[PDB]
């Protein structure tokens, strides 16, 4: 469980992410696709994008980035009490999109990488540690739902 002080570090930097949701969303998805190409193959809607320039130019990719970060933000602001938000997400990602938990670890790494690039002064070691913990909590709760449904993996 994150302490109140750790949640404050997470939300203080998230308020900055919200100043440019679309720019952030885009950098995250691109970092994910370049670092872990197998992840792009899960998106029939983005599979045709081959280069980073092509990814940067896609307005549809930018729109999905806002969708991803908006959902994540609603979860983070619940400070661990995210049962109602997390459930629909685990169900669709496990049963409809077939996303293994490992890919959720990959996007977590991408989020941390981007926050670090864009907000050095608001993202020192202490904030990076709190953010990692918040993302691990998210994965842990989703992994439990996956197990229930028969998808742990
Ligand atoms: C490697 C693939 C991958 C990852 C790691 C991932 C991780 C995450 C993530 C973790 C931080 C968040 C908050 C979301 C949030 C969402 N994802 Co995904 N998703 C993934 C693949 C998908 C796919 C595929 C879709 C459907 C896209 C489409 O066709 O519109 C998707 C749809 C969504 C939607 C639309 C509604 C729904 O279908 O659930 C939201 C919200 N998500 N996703």
Swiss-Prot record:
Protein EC: 1.7.-.-, 1.11.1.-
Listed SUPFAM superfamilies: Globin-like
Gene3D superfamilies per UniProt: 6.10.140.2100, 6.10.140.2110
Cross-referenced InterPro entries: Globin, Globin-like_sf, Myoglobin
Any GO BP annotation: removal of superoxide radicals
Phosphoserine: modified positions: 3
Enzyme class: oxidoreductase
Annotated keywords: Cytoplasm, Heme, Iron, Metal-binding, Muscle protein, Oxidoreductase, Oxygen transport, Phosphoprotein, Transport
Subcellular localization(s) per the UniProt record: Cytoplasm, Sarcoplasm
GO cellular-component term (any): sarcoplasm
MF GO annotations: heme binding; metal ion binding; nitrite reductase activity; oxygen binding; oxygen carrier activity; peroxidase activity
Binding site for nitrite: 64
Domain Globin: 1-147
Function text: Monomeric heme protein which primary function is to store oxygen and facilitate its diffusion within muscle tissues. Reversibly binds oxygen through a pentacoordinated heme iron and enables its timely and efficient release as needed during periods of heightened demand. Depending on the oxidative conditions of tissues and cells, and in addition to its ability to bind oxygen, it also has a nitrite reductase activity whereby it regulates the production of bioactive nitric oxide.
Quaternary assembly: Monomeric.
Designated name of the protein: Myoglobin
Species per Swiss-Prot/TrEMBL record: Physeter macrocephalus
Organism ancestry: Eukaryota, Metazoa, Chordata, Craniata, Vertebrata
């Amino acid at each position: 469980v994150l302490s109140e002080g750790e949640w404050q570090l997470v939300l203080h930097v998230w308020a900055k992410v919200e100043a440019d949701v679309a720019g952030h969303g885009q950098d995250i998805l691109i970092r994910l696709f370049k670092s872990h190409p197998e992840t792009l193959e899960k998106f029939d809607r983005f599979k045709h994008l081959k280069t980073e320039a092509e990814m940067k130019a896609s307005e549809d990719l930018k729109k999905h980035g806002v969708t991803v970060l908006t959902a994540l933000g609603a979860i983070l602001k619940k400070k661990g009490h995210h049962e109602a938000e997390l459930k629909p997400l685990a169900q669709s990602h496990a049963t409809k999109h077939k996303i293994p938990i490992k890919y959720l670890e990959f996007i977590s790494e991408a989020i941390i990488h981007v926050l670090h690039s864009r907000h050095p002064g608001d993202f020192g070691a202490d904030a990076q540690g709190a953010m990692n913990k918040a993302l691990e909590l998210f994965r842990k709760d989703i992994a439990a739902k996956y197990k229930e449904l028969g998808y742990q993996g």
